[PDB]
Amino acid sequence: NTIHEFKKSAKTTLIKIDPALKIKTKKVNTADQCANRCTRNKGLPFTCKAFVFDKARKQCLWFPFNSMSSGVKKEFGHEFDLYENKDYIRNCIIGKGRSYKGTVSITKSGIKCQPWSSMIPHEHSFLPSSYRGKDLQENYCRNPRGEEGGPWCFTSNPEVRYEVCDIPQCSEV
Amino acid sequence: TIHEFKKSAKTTLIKIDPALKIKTKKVNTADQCANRCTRNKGLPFTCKAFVFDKARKQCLWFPFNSMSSGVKKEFGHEFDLYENKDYIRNCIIGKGRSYKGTVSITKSGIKCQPWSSMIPHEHSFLPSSYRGKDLQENYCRNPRGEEGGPWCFTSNPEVRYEVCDIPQCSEVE
Numbered sequence: 001n002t003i004h005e006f007k008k009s010a011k012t013t014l015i016k017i018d019p020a021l022k023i024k025t026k027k028v029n030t031a032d033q034c035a036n037r038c039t040r041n042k043g044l045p046f047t048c049k050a051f052v053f054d055k056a057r058k059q060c061l062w063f064p065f066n067s068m069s070s071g072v073k074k075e076f077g078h079e080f081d082l083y084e085n086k087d088y089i090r091n092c093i094i095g096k097g098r099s100y101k102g103t104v105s106i107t108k109s110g111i112k113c114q115p116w117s118s119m120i121p122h123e124h125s126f127l128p129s130s131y132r133g134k135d136l137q138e139n140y141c142r143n144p145r146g147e148e149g150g151p152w153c154f155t156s157n158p159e160v161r162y163e164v165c166d167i168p169q170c171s172e173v
Numbered sequence: 174t175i176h177e178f179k180k181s182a183k184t185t186l187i188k189i190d191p192a193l194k195i196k197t198k199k200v201n202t203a204d205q206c207a208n209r210c211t212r213n214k215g216l217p218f219t220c221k222a223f224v225f226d227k228a229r230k231q232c233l234w235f236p237f238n239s240m241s242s243g244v245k246k247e248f249g250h251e252f253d254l255y256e257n258k259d260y261i262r263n264c265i266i267g268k269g270r271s272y273k274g275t276v277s278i279t280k281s282g283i284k285c286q287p288w289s290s291m292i293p294h295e296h297s298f299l300p301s302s303y304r305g306k307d308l309q310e311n312y313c314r315n316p317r318g319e320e321g322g323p324w325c326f327t328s329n330p331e332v333r334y335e336v337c338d339i340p341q342c343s344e345v346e
């Protein structure tokens with residue numbers, strides 16, 4: 001059961017635009033069945049980088065791309081959940097990491113991040129809707145304004161309003 | 174939980190920067206170390222790796238891994254090193270000579286052949302004669318810095334070798 005290993009985006013699927021890209025679909029019972037086949041890469045003529053579970057049609061859609069891939073777009077739908085394989089979500093930062101989309105959710109001193117959608121412990125104005133494109137989802141370390149410190153978060157410790165996270169540069173020699 | 178880590182048998186790490194934090198505890202199994210590291214509970218830092226001492230049954234949790242500056246990889250028969258995948262660079266620089274991630278699937282979705290195995294394909298890419306290149310398990314690797322990036326011998330007898338589909342670090346925003 002490998003589903004908990006993916007980054008989940010609720011109410012989202014992906015569409016191709018460029019009809020050149022390949023997909024694979026199958027009717028199943030549950031979303032974990034999609035996860036298992038993606039993780040194992042069993043019976044897919046490509047590298048599985050993401051999948052969608054359609055809760056209304058009971059279908060897996062397996063993709064050789066993710067939401068960051070050229071020539072693919074997100075589409076809204078209540079019936080869809082998107083699961084992106086973390087092996088294909090860049091886990092290091094470029095520059096100040098304005099574009100960081102990874103799932104690290106703990107600060108440098110080991111404090112669990114507060115969710116962006118929460119005002120507890122800390123009241124703030126970094127609402128997800130105010131920062132579209134910046135993926136202020138769950139409690140992930142982010143740098144929505146591109147400040148010099150790198151990705152950071154409001155902290156779950158009431159005594160520490162915010163702290164930077166410890167995410168490595170992709171390349172610094 | 175332990176499967177969100179890359180395992181290196183008979184290996185531990187030693188810090189040469191005395192300021193770097195460490196935490197240890199007597200435990201029962203390596204699984205219990207993985208748990209605490211993943212949940213990051215009671216650790217005053219970001220857990221990036223841990224070692225399990227099988228002789229003393231002790232966890233050693235680290236805010237660093239084998240790619241961090243200020244730490245050394247050392248042989249020890251009683252140690253196993255477990256590195257958190259969120260902190261092993263999952264994109265390619267240049268031709269991917271330094272790629273150490275755990276992707277083991279080719280571009281066309283074929284499971285890689287283990288480097289130590291000679292079935293179905295016979296080869297001279299022996300681990301011992303390629304020290305430093307991390308030719309362990311069936312991971313996509315680029316030991317000679319060849320054009321297409323990391324690749325592997327394939328588990329399909331009709332495809333000797335194929336590149337994998339590991340993105341360049343420059344591919345995305």
Ligand SMILES: O=C(O)CCc1ccco1
Nearest residue numbers: 123124125147152161162
């Ligand atoms: O404390 C706040 O609401 C500002 C958030 C922040 C922390 C670091 C840079 O900006």
